[PDB]
Amino acid sequence: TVTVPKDLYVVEYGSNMTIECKFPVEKQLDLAALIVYWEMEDKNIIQFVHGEEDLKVQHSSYRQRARLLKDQLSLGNAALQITDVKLQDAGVYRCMISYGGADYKRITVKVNAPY
Template sequence: MEDRWNVLFQGLFRMLVICLVLAIFFPVYEADFTGKVFGQTEPVVCLVGEDVILPCTLRNNVSTVNAVKEAVEWQKMDLTQKDVHFYTDSRDSNMDQIPSYRGRTSLFKEELRKGNISLKLTSVKLSDAGEYSCSVPSLHRNEKAFIQLKVGAVSQPVISIMGPKDDGVVLKCESGGWYPEPKMTWLDSDGSILPDGPIETQIDSEGRYTVRGEVTIQKTDNNKFTCRVNQLQINQMKETEMNIPGDVVTS
């Protein structure tokens, strides 16, 4: 009888050791079952007036998690009043929403059961730029995914002929309403950058930039010149091409 008890005790001891090892090396977190939120590491870029989607997904280690009955919260981190969109009890609840976002935010309700808790933001404004957080407070109050939104504004450059100068003619280019501040470049018909004249930049009350520049050109085979304005941060470029009449450019 004593031997049987010894065997039973040794068996229980081995099981306890195995459970302890598994608990140390393979811990089971609540998130494995309830899910975590995942955003996008790269910034989301859009232009003023466009609609944009801020991506966020609720999933566990294996698959997406149904979010229909969960609370979903979107906030803008650089504001004192942070609430951008709140969903709970299977409906939107935006009583405390930032006024400038009213009527412009929505979730993809039909996609919630697939774990898609992305936010759609319509008619984007320059002031919408910044860092947003996505969370499911009904599961993890302090766990958030962060998404950076960059907002740009662009316009088409306009070229005009100012008049003759020395042995050439002066062209002027102007493009307004840009954000962030853009760069202007002149090119000839071969795509070579021309040495430009003075570049003037102004900023208006809304924070948008107007850039103006001049270049003195000489007669070429086809008298075709391009004013290019670009902004690398938002990966935007606008250009206007002009063919100058031969009789305007002196030989």
């Protein structure tokens, strides 16, 4: 089962965020069995297939800001890091992990502008 440590993030304008998305890993991760999808309101952020990614399919509004952290991935955490968080980044993020079965979770991100 895919689990999330939390399903709501409130993150500061201009900061970096890491959204987590956990799945069961045994002694070692098998890339040949793993697909990860991160999506946000019809925008494709990460489309990871057995180790393979193609920047060309990443939605323009996440270019150079959004990546799947590979060290975490190796621990069963398909963590999406988004740098320089924008107000437009607020919304519902969806992760799908396929790894000995497919499951998914939804995560709300809110962006605050403290003063």
